[PDB]
Design a protein around this motif. Structure first.
Motif, short mmCIF file in Angstrom:
data_model
loop_
_atom_site.label_atom_id
_atom_site.label_comp_id
_atom_site.label_asym_id
_atom_site.label_seq_id
_atom_site.Cartn_x
_atom_site.Cartn_y
_atom_site.Cartn_z
N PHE A 116 49.79 65.84 77.24
CA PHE A 116 50.17 66.57 76.04
C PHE A 116 50.50 65.61 74.89
N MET A 117 50.78 66.21 73.74
CA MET A 117 50.93 65.52 72.48
C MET A 117 52.33 65.78 71.92
N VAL A 118 52.96 64.73 71.41
CA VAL A 118 54.32 64.83 70.89
C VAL A 118 54.26 65.47 69.51
N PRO A 119 54.92 66.61 69.28
CA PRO A 119 54.87 67.23 67.95
C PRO A 119 55.61 66.41 66.91
N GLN A 120 55.23 66.63 65.66
CA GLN A 120 55.87 65.97 64.53
C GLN A 120 57.15 66.70 64.15
N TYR A 121 58.10 65.94 63.60
CA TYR A 121 59.39 66.47 63.21
C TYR A 121 59.43 66.75 61.71
N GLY A 122 60.14 67.81 61.34
CA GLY A 122 60.34 68.16 59.95
C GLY A 122 61.46 69.17 59.86
N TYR A 123 62.04 69.29 58.66
CA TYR A 123 63.16 70.19 58.49
C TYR A 123 63.14 70.79 57.09
N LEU A 124 63.92 71.85 56.93
CA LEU A 124 64.06 72.58 55.68
C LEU A 124 65.49 72.47 55.17
N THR A 125 65.68 72.85 53.91
CA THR A 125 67.00 72.85 53.29
C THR A 125 67.05 73.98 52.27
#
Lengths: 519, 519, 100, 49, 150, 20
Positions: free
Chosen positions: E133-142
Motif C-alpha cells: 500500500f501507499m502512505v497518504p499525504q497529510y493536510g489540514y484545514l483552518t
C-alpha cells in the motif's frame, strides 16, 4: 547476524557411518524467482474438460523446499553399502539450514540484461510445524535436491486444491494466505536453522524371504490331520458311487496340508508383455484398468496394493499401473518409448503377496447335492481376512521417502502404497519467498493497488542432514548371498557418473531388498 | 437418610462451559408402575411368524434408566455453541442421582380412583457395574430423559433375549433373575448416588474436510513418475498397431497420477429419489435391500458402513436403509409419510468415504492378449485394503451417544455404525423396581404362591451430570466458515420451542460436522 | 410433595416487575394473597414471531426443592442510588433574587 | 465480554452459504484481486431489555 | 482477550516537492464547499478500520460468541526501511539504492496537530496481508471567511 | 431441615425506627 562480507554456514555434505546409525548430510545451491507477480491466483480446471480431470484451488507467490527422495540424500556407493549389510532402517533426526543468501536485481533496457546486487532486500521463510496448510509433499512431484551435489536447482512454486463441484467451488472450500503466518525475514548475512525429530515408525523390510507361505513345513514328516481326498470309491465296483475317503497329507501331497496363514489382500490388475506385438491391438488403458471412483469421478490406482509383479520364469509381463516407472536422463515427459523408461520389479514378495496379474483363488458359490454338481467362482478382489500376512512395497534410491497419513477417523495399514514411511507428523514444509520491492510511487496519493514492483530474484545454499537408525543382519545361512554390484565389463562410461557433456544419469533402479530371512 | 418432611437433593440442571471441558447436567421427573404383576415371564416369538422375526427371551418386573441420547443431555443453544467452535469432543466423567422418591398407593372401588401416600413402602435400585446382565442400551430404544426439562417421563420395562432354535429355546440359553443381585432399598427420605469414569476413547471428528483424497497434490507441478497413457502409436502409420507409450501426469491429466491412499470400504445400497413418482413401482424393500444373514436368518443393515449419501448436485437421492431417519413431533409409528420424517444426510464425508449408491470401482478379471481384449468387472462390495483411509458417521443432537463393544475375540473398527463412542465398559444400567406389598393373607396357612398384592406406583427425581472434554479448533483459513444458525425470517413459532398447546418439537436434525480441516 | 423455588440473581429471565402489575403483599397483614403467574414477551412481526425471538425454560435453572419442614432464605444489598426528594420548594426559579 | 444467555432455542449467527459458486467469499479471483462481498455487523446475539 | 497483529509493506513518495502549500477552495465555488488550509510534504499511517486489523474468520468468530469488546493496548513498529533513488534519462527509468539517505518519523502524542483520522478517508493497511500500500499525504484545514482566511 | 411437626420461621412484621 553478520555483515555483507561474512559468510554464514559452510558446505558440509559427506556422510558418517556409526555403529548403529548413519548420518547423511548434503548441501546444494538453489535459485528462486518471484511467482505470480506477488499475487494469489484462483485456478479452476477448464471450461469443457473431462469430469475426472476437474479441480479448484489457488496458486501462491511462495516457494517450498523438497527433499523427499532417497537420491536427494544418499549416494550410489552409500546406498549400495546400506542395502548390502542391513535388514532395515528408518529415520531418526533431521536438521535443516539456509544460508549464504543473496538477492539480485535485474534490469532490462534492450536485448541485453544486467544483474546487480541488492543488499537491503529481505527474504521471507517459515516452516508449517503445526500442519495447517495443505501438505503437497509426498505426491511424487518434481524439484528436490538434485542427486548430484554440483547441480544448482530451482525452488518449486506452491499451490493447493480444495473442494470443487465441477469446475466451480463450494462454500466449504478454504482459502489460506501464507502471509498470514509468523515468518522470519532475513538479509544477506542472516541464516535460518531448523531441527526436527521423527516419531516412532516400523523398520523398513530391506530383505527378501528364503521361505514361502505354502512351503513352511517339514518335508519329511506327514501331518496327523485328515483331509477328504476322494469322493468316489477306491475299491473295485465302487468307483462310480459316492463314498467319502480321508487321507493324511505328507511330502508328496504337499498342496493339501493344513496351514495357519493366508496371502495378503489382492486387487487384480491387467497384464502387459514387454514385447509390443504380444499385446492386444487397442487403446485399452483407462478402459481396462483397475480404477476406483469417489464423489462421482474416477481415479487410477497406479501403485496399488503391494503385489508381486510376475510369476517365476516370466520376466516379461508386468501389471498395468502396478509398479513405479522412472524416467531415464533426457527423456520426454509425453509418450516416451518403453526402452526410455525404467520399470521397477517387485518379485521379491512373491512368497507372501499374491501376484498382481492372477487371482486370489476360487470360492464355492452353491449348495452341491445329488442333482446339482458343485460350482465355484474365481475371486479377483480380496479384502482382509483373519490370519492374513503380507509384505510392503520396496523403496528405491530414487523413490519417495515418506508421506503424510491423512487425519481421518479410520486407518487399516498406514504404510503409503507408493513407498516408505507414513508419518502423522512428517517433516514440515519450509516455504521461502522474495518480499516485493515497490517501484517509484506516484507523487500524488492514489488508493489503487500497487502493481509496479522491481524485478529481482534470489539465490543461496541449503544444507540438510538426516540421522537414520540401522538394523543389522545376523543370518545363519551358510552359502553366500545375493548383493548389488557394478558390472566389471568394459564400457564407454561408468554407471552413476557424468558423461562428456557433464550430465548426471541414473541407469537402473536399485531396491533395498537383497538379503534374506525365514518366514 | 432423613424423615418424611425433608427433601433429598435439589433441581440442578444448567450447564457450565470451562476452558477445555463442559459440564452438562440435567434433572427430570420420572414415574414408575409395577410390571408383569411382579412376575418374570417367558416370551417366545409366535406360532407361525416369519423365520427372521423369531426370538426367545424373558421380561422382568424391573425398570431401567436411559439417557443415551445427546438431546437427553444437551440443549439446542448448547449444541450449536459446541459444534460451531470445536473440532471434537468426548465424555470424561459421569454422575447420577435419584432422590425425592414417593411411593403412592392406588385404590379402585368405582369408576373413580383414589391415590394416597404410602410412607413405609421401599423401592429397589441397583447398577450392573460388573456387566453381567445383557446390555439393552445402545439399541435406539425409546424412553430417555425427554429433551424438554419440564416433561415428566416414564421408566421403561426391562427384558432380554437369548439363544433360540426357532420359536423354542436351547440348553445353552441363560436365565437371569435380577432379584439375585445385591440391591439398595430406599424409602421416602433416602437417595441413591453413583459415579463413573469413561475409558480412553478417540475424539469424535466434528469437522468436514476442505480437501479430497483424489485432489491432494500441487496443481502447478508435474509428477516425475511415468504412466502408460497409450497402447496404439501416436505417429502416422502406427495408429492401428500396438505400441506402449508413457507420459507424466500433470495438472491437466490430474486423474492419472500416482497416489498413496484409497477410499474407505464400501457395501453398496439401493438408491431412492425423494420424489415418489421417480422410483420403481414395486414393493422392493426387503427384496432389493443389502442384507446380511447369520444362523440361517436374514437381517437388515440400516445404518451400514459410513458412506456418503449422494454425489454433488444430487440433493434428491438417498440410499435405502443408509442413514438415520428421525420422527417429527406427533408422527405415527406405522407407515408415516415422507414429509413427516427427518432423513439425515452424510454428504460431508464425500471426500474420503465412497458414495453409497455407486460402486467402489472396477477390477480387471482376465488375461488380455492379441486374440482376447481386456475385460473388467465392477465391484460393489469392498473389504479392507492397505492404505485405506475413511471417516466415521456423524452424531446428531437426537442420536445415540455410545454403545457396548461386544466381548469377542476379534474387532476391526469398534466404532458403532449407528453413532458415537464405542466402549468396552460403558455406563452401567441402573435398574429400579417397586417392592411387592402383599394384601391381607389368609388366616389359615397355605403354601400356594402369593398372588394378591396392593396396587401402587412410584415417582421421583433423577439428576444426571456428564463432564465432556473439548478439542479447540486452530484453523488458518482466511475466509469465514459455515455454521449453524436460526433463520431470521418471520414465522408463526420459533424453532425448538413449545407451541400454543405446550408440546416441544425438534424441526430439523443437527450434525456436529461444520468446521473444516485439511486431509 | 416438594416445591421448587429459585431467584434469578444473574438477571437472565425477562424482568416483569416494575410494570405496575397486580399481586403484591396486600396492604393489610391479615389478608391472604395469591401468587401471580409468570409470563414474558419477545420480538414479534405482527402476531407471529421472528428468528431473533428467545425462549426461556425455567426448569433449566438450578432450583431448590423443599418439603414441609424446609425453608428458603435470601439476602440482597441495593446499589448506590440518589435520595428521593421528599420535599417541596419554598422558592421559584423565576423568583430567586433580591427583591430590593 | 462473554455471553451467558439462558435462551433455550438456538441463535442466529453468521455463516457462509454452502451452495456451489464460481468463487468463494472473501478470497482472491483468477486475477488476484481481493474483494469483500457483503458487510458484516457485530450484532448477532440477543439480550433482554 | 484477543491479540490481533498484522504486518504490511508500504511505499512513500515525496509530496509537494518538499514544500508546504496553501490551499483555498476555488474562485466561484459553492458557498457550502468552501475551505482554507495547508498541504504538507508529510505522510501519515492509517489503521482505523476493522478490516485493516481483523480477518473474516476472526471477525465471524468474534461476533458469534461475544456480547461486546473494546481495545486495550496498542503496539506499532516500522522496520526494513529502504530509500531508493530514481534516475530518468530517456523513456526508461532506473532505480538504485541510496544507503545514506534518512527518513523522518514522529508521533503526535500531545495532540497538537489537527486530527484528520476518523473522517472515513482512504489508505489504511489493506485487508489482504499480501497487498502493498501507499502512505497518504497529510493536510489540514483552518478557519475561513469564504475562500480567504482570518 | 426439620420434621412435619416443627414450624420453620415465625411471624415477625412490625417496624423499627433507628437514628438514621
Amino acid at each position: 547476524a553478520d555483515g555483507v562480507g561474512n559468510s554464514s554456514g559452510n558446505w558440509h555434505c559427506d556422510s558418517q557411518w556409526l555403529g548403529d546409525r548413519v548420518i547423511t548430510t548434503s548441501t546444494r545451491t538453489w535459485a528462486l524467482p518471484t511467482y505470480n507477480n506477488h499475487l494469489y491466483k484462483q485456478i479452476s480446471s477448464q471450461s469443457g474438460a473431462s469430469n475426472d480431470n476437474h479441480y479448484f484451488g489457488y496458486s501462491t507467490p511462495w516457494g517450498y523446499f523438497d527433499f523427499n527422495r532417497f537420491h536427494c540424500h544418499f549416494s550410489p556407493r552409500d546406498w549400495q553399502r546400506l542395502i548390502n549389510n542391513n535388514w532395515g532402517f528408518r529415520p531418526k533426526k533431521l536438521s535443516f539450514k539456509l544460508f549464504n543468501i543473496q538477492v539480485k536485481e535485474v534490469t532490462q533496457n534492450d536485448g541485453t540484461t544486467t544483474i546487480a546486487n541488492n543488499l537491503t532486500s529481505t527474504v521471507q521463510v517459515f516452516t508449517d510445524s503445526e500442519y495447517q496448510l495443505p501438505y503437497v509433499l509426498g505426491s511424487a512431484h518434481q524439484g528436490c535436491l538434485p542427486p548430484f551435489p554440483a547441480d544448482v536447482f530451482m525452488v518449486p512454486q506452491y499451490g493447493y486444491l480444495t473442494l470443487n463441484n465441477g469446475s466451480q467451488a463450494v462454500g466449504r472450500s478454504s482459502f489460506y494466505c501464507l502471509e498470514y503466518f509468523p515468518s522470519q525475514m532475513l538479509r544477506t548475512g542472516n541464516n535460518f536453522q531448523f531441527s526436527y525429530t521423527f516419531e516412532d515408525v516400523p523398520f523398513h523390510s530391506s530383505y527378501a524371504h528364503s521361505q514361502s507361505l505354502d512351503r513352511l513345513m517339514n518335508p519329511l514328516i506327514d501331518q496327523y490331520l485328515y483331509y477328504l481326498n476322494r469322493t468316489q470309491g477306491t475299491t473295485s465296483g465302487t468307483t462310480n458311487q459316492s463314498r467319502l475317503l480321508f487321507s493324511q497329507a505328507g511330502p508328496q501331497s504337499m498342496s493339501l496340508q493344513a496351514r495357519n496363514w493366508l496371502p495378503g489382500p489382492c486387487y487384480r490388475q491387467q497384464r502387459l508383455s514387454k514385447t509390443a506385438n504380444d499385446n492386444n491391438n487397442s487403446n485399452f488403458p483407462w478402459t481396462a484398468a483397475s480404477k476406483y471412483h469417489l464423489n462421482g469421478r474416477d481415479s487410477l490406482v497406479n501403485p496399488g496394493p503391494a503385489m508381486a509383479s510376475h510369476k517365476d520364469d516370466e520376466e516379461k509381463f508386468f501389471p498395468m499401473h502396478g509398479n513405479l516407472i522412472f524416467g531415464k536422463e533426457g527423456t520426454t515427459a509425453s509418450n516416451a518409448e518403453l526402452d526410455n523408461v525404467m520399470i521397477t520389479d517387485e518379485e521379491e514378495i512373491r512368497t507372501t503377496n499374491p501376484v498382481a496379474t492372477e487371482q486370489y483363488g476360487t470360492v464355492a458359490n452353491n449348495l452341491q447335492s445329488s442333482n446339482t454338481a458343485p460350482t465355484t467362482r474365481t475371486v479377483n478382489d480380496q479384502g482382509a481376512l483373519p490370519g492374513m500376512v503380507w509384505q510392503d512395497r520396496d523403496v528405491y534410491l530414487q523413490g519417495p521417502i515418506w508421506a503424510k497419513i491423512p487425519h481421518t477417523d479410520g486407518h487399516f495399514h498406514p504404510s503409503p502404497l507408493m513407498g516408505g514411511f507414513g508419518l502423522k507428523h512428517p517433516p514440515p514444509q519450509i516455504m521461502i519467498k522474495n518480499t516485493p520491492v515497490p517501484a517509484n510511487p506516484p507523487t500524488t496519493f492514489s488508493p489503487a493497488k500497487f502493481a509496479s514492483f522491481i524485478t529481482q530474484y534470489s539465490t543461496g545454499q541449503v544444507s540438510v542432514e538426516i540421522e537414520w537408525e540401522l538394523q543389522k543382519e545376523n543370518s545363519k545361512r551358510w552359502n553366500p548371498e545375493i548383493q548389488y554390484t557394478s558390472n566389471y565389463n568394459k564400457s564407454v562410461n561408468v554407471d552413476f557418473t557424468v558423461d562428456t557433456n557433464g550430465v548426471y544419469s541414473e541407469p537402473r533402479p536399485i531396491g533395498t531388498r537383497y538379503l534374506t530371512r525365514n518366514l
